[PDB]
A paper describes a structure:
Reasoning the negatively charged Glu would mimic negatively charged pTyr (phosphotyrosine) and create a protein resembling a locked phosphorylated state, several Tyr-to-Glu mutants were constructed in WzcK540M. Analysis of cryo-EM images of WzcK540M with four Glu residues (designated WzcK540M4YE) revealed ~50% octamers, as well as other state(s). A 2.8 Å-resolution structure of the WzcK540M4YE octamer was determined using the same approach as WzcK540M. Overall, this structure has similar octameric (rmsd 3.1 Å over 4520 Cα atoms) and monomeric (rmsd of 2.5 Å over 651 Cα atoms) arrangements seen in WzcK540M. The core kinase domain is unchanged between the structures (rmsd 0.4 Å for Cα atoms 452–697) but the tyrosine-rich tail has undergone a large change that now places Y708 at the active site (compared Y717 in WzcK540M). Motif 3 still possesses the same three structural arrangements seen in WzcK540M but only two (not three) monomers have the fully ordered class i arrangement (rmsd of 0.4 Å for 133 Cα atoms). The larger rmsd value for the monomer and octamer, compare to the individual regions, reflects shifts in the relative positions of the regions. This can be visualised by superimposing the core kinase domains of monomer for WzcK540M and WzcK540M4YE, which shows a rigid body rotation of 11° at the other end of the molecule. Superposition using all the Cα atoms in octamer reveals shifts in the periplasmic helices, particularly those in class ii. Comparing WzcK540M vs WzcK540M4YE revealed the distribution of arrangements changed, suggesting the helical bundles are particularly sensitive to changes elsewhere in the structure. The structure of WzcK540M4YE, chosen to mimic a phosphorylated state, showed a significant conformational change in the tyrosine tail, which would be predicted to weaken the octamer.
Author numbering:
A (entry chain C): 17 to 64, 85 to 279, 384 to 477, 494 to 709
B (entry chain B): 17 to 64, 85 to 279, 385 to 477, 494 to 709
Write the structure that this text describes.
């Protein structure tokens, strides 16, 4: 988990980490290139406070007058069936479609849920067009207003590209307020200065400048209207109260004072400069999400790789087994590769390591009480028969006579791999229905005598206790230089602990990443309980990255 | 309790955790889907302070005038017998019912507790209807008012759906003010700006906009009736004081006060009349559902950890080996009246018993005799299961096995192997039977079996009798193995009496039932009695924790 280990596993998993980081950056870049650009326009309003004005601008009288001025409750979008059709259309350089509807009146379904009757325009040419509400397509021409089925459309200046689809939505006036008010924004930047910087953000650049100018003009007009409206209510009741006659003349003097004031009462709000749209979109923020894509890919990659590190629990190196006090006799690397590897590809790495095992056993197998070696995998799929068979081959070619007993009576398949006469296997001998001679075979490849399990017997462990088995071993250890026995795991059945009574040397075979140290520890302790002293293990299937062996020649 | 152990038990208990988290999330879904929506409407009120205004709008003078204006003390609900009938009615798309009562006068029961006389409207059609107060159903039609039994009711524009029930409550004016006031709210957002955000929240969307509009109008008229009242008091005194140049000056002031009074532009303007946000603000969807998820998750965690800190039994042979107990086996639970070792010989729980046979055969050599005693740490430790199957799995090997069931209190081996209940073990110790008529032969396992026989009155006094050692000495010569079942030592002392003659003694501990304390005390009490317990035999270990697996 150290920095060195970190970089090691990173370069080892460089494919995964770069793949995930690159794919998230691909999502980021496609999103940055497909998200519609959003321009921002600004204006400067000057007054002589400004705290009421930042709230009166965003009031519904102001926005509500712009909406009715520009008909912004008539919403128009070019149709693109995919969620990214519009973005790719912009990327291709296609000029976006746009039309002007000066007067819209839907059939006004205006239901509780679907209060936005949605219609689609099919552009037929630059002059005529067709409108489908729910299938009923009404063909129409710009100029002439379409008044059918309670549906009133006055659409003019339709765009060029025909065949397009334009979704029209007569969303409610309150909605046409709320969206704008969401986009609209005000500030002061002087905390007392009359300057207000209105900002409106939107997609259609030319539209937002007009909308902001409309807001500014409405604000100008309404402030002119208010100061005058004070005097206007005064004037209204003066007009209502005119009938004493000298007082009538005094009221006429006040009337003439008030009347002109209304026309002349223009002030207190100022458009220092009308709205213009900044050509550079402010959103989507390029180079701010792509770096977020990079960092998101990096963080998720590390949080996944660390999770996988804390996932696996199998053996990782012989040092783990030697920590418990287990003499790992070999580390057989996994070979890329029906005949024996030790005779098919005699110079493979996995066979060089088995020769390295042969020498170490040859040293460790003298002083053993007899020349019978028992090899029991830690579990199925630990390769016990692979290692035992190749070891038998590599010891046969040396020149010693080897007998390879496959005492895995439960699911042993060595006879399925050496070529066999399935009759008269091992089990058929223990049952007493076969003699010691008709069971041995000759693997022509390895050159070592082979004894197969034969038929699966109903009672394996009961058979192995029969005293004929020790007779077999006593005879063979006199007629052979080495005897290798295959036995089932000790975590599953007790066959291994029965055969181990007669074996001089016993070894476990542990698959590299499959079997855990717990399985080896429990297996060795369970062998000891049964009076069988496990000599050591033979780590197997170690990946070539962690295997010390390499080609030499 | 470690992260690995945490996730292991979570996946093991994945059914429980997902079940409870899912059902609380379902409760959250149904609540969020049935909780009646509440809309809020907004209006904007300007002044040129606003600190008095935020408390004068909420005064009873203003609210109580809207109440009397819109008849808000006349409360109406569509009736739904369940607590969720209204919600599901909305779910089904059914348009909610509503009527209009322009004039309600109940009998005015107005008791101390039931100061809110409640009646129910039964909609008969679009024109007529019936009202039951306490059973007395009065039929009436819109238009004509029902004035009977002191009940003056004028309902018009009754809804369409007939047969419905409408609960009508003439709640007192103070309550009809207080509810509006708890829903009502004010703010300023400028701290000196005249801008006030009136906000009112209700369920009926169209109603609350009208309510807030009426509040605004009442407030506006009240502001007129303060300032126009100042000018009107001045003008009223002029009108009362008018009795010639001074008269013309007073007439000038008269018309000036006329215009100043009647103009009376309020310091307040309604910026924009109240409108209702179509999106309900409560119930807050996706804010309680996530709270439902986190609540289910936290309660699942706190319950699973509690159950973790609930069980005290053995959890693995390592716990026994820590104390210094040689766990000779771990027999897993078998799914499965004949012996398992002859019924289903390939069962995992029998493979483990063969594994025990081999370890005993090694560990039982050098023992002073071939007698094995197996005593469970408690009843329901499966002692007889293990001993019987072990005797079977040793019998098929070919050794002659004698199986003595010395559980003279509640032994039931004869109830399992098929029996001649006469002449059991007790009938031998009592001296009324000889050693030969007590022995049987289980045809299945193939081992000679000695039943306890009749429950004696004094078990322990019998077992001390010297005939028992005669039996064992004779058997150990005529049999290759002798297995003795004995009662738990924590309950009676028979086990420590038989153990004097047993070469090997083993305890059987159920996996999660028996604790480490029971095993430790059992071995200490065996030691005090001069019986050296060889080791334990963990029993009934669950397949999740056992290393055994099928092979073949």
């Amino acid at each position: 988990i150290d920095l060195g280990r970190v970089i090691g596993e990173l370069i080892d998993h460089r494919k995964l980490i770069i793949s995930i980081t690159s794919v998230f950056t691909l999502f980021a870049i496609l999103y940055a290139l497909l998200a519609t650009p959003i321009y921002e326009t600004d204006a400067l309003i000057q007054i002589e406070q400004s705290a009421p004005e930042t709230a009166l601008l965003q009031s519904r009288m102001i926005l509500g007058k712009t909406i009715d001025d520009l008909n912004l409750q008539i919403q128009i979008e070019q149709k693109y069936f995919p969620v990214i059709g519009r973005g790719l259309a912009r990327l291709m350089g296609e000029k976006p479609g746009n039309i002007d509807i000066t007067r819209l009146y839907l059939p006004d379904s205006d239901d509780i849920s679907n209060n936005t009757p949605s219609i689609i325009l099919t552009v037929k040419d630059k002059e005529n067009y067709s409108i489908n509400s729910d299938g009923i397509q009404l063909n129409g021409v710009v100029g002439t207003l379409l008044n059918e089925k309670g549906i009133s459309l006055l659409v003019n200046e339709i765009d060029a590209k025909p065949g397009d689809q334009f979704v029209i939505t007569q969303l409610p006036r309150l909605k046409a307020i709320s969206d704008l008010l969401k986009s609209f924004s005000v500030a002061d930047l002087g905390k007392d200065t009359g300057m207000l910087t209105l900002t409106l953000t939107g997609d259609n650049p030319k539209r937002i400048s007009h909308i902001l100018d409309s807001i500014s003009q409405n604000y100008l007009a309404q402030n002119i209207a208010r100061q005058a409206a004070q005097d206007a209510k005064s004037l209204e009741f003066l007009n209502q109260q005119l009938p004493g006659r000298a007082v009538y003349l005094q009221l006429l003097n006040r009337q003439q004072e008030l009347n002109i004031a209304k026309s002349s009462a223009i002030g207190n709000v100022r458009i220092i400069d009308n709205a213009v749209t900044d050509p550079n979109p402010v959103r989507p923020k390029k180079t701010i999400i792509i770096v977020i894509g990079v960092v998101l890919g990096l963080i998720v990659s590390v949080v996944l790789v660390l999770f996988q590190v804390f996932l696996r629990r199998g053996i990782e190196s012989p040092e783990q087994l030697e920590e418990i006090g287990i003499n790992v006799y070999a580390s057989i690397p996994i070979s890329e590769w029906d005949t024996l590897l030790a005779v098919g590809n005699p110079a493979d790495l996995a066979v060089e390591a088995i020769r390295g095992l042969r020498t170490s056993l040859h040293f460790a197998m003298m002083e053993a009480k007899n020349n019978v070696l028992m090899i029991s995998g830690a579990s199925p799929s630990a390769g016990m028969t692979f290692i035992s068979s190749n070891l038998a081959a590599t010891i046969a070619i040396t020149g010693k006579k080897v007998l390879f007993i496959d005492a895995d009576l439960r699911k042993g398949y060595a006879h399925k791999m050496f070529g066999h006469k399935n009759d008269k296997g091992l089990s058929e001998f223990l049952s007493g229905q076969a003699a010691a001679e008709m069971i041995i075979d000759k693997v022509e490849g390895g050159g070592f005598d082979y004894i197969g399990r034969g038929q699966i017997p109903p009672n394996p462990a009961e058979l192995l206790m029969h005293p004929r088995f020790e007779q077999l071993l006593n005879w063979a250890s006199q007629n052979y230089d080495l005897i290798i026995i295959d036995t089932p795991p000790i975590l599953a059945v007790t066959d291994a602990a029965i055969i181990g009574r007669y074996a001089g040397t016993c070894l476990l075979v542990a698959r590299f990443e499959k079997n855990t140290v717990k399985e080896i520890d429990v297996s060795m302790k369970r062998f000891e309980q049964s009076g069988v002293v496990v000599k050591g293990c033979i780590l197997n299937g170690v990946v070539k990255k962690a295997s010390s062996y390499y080609r030499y020649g």
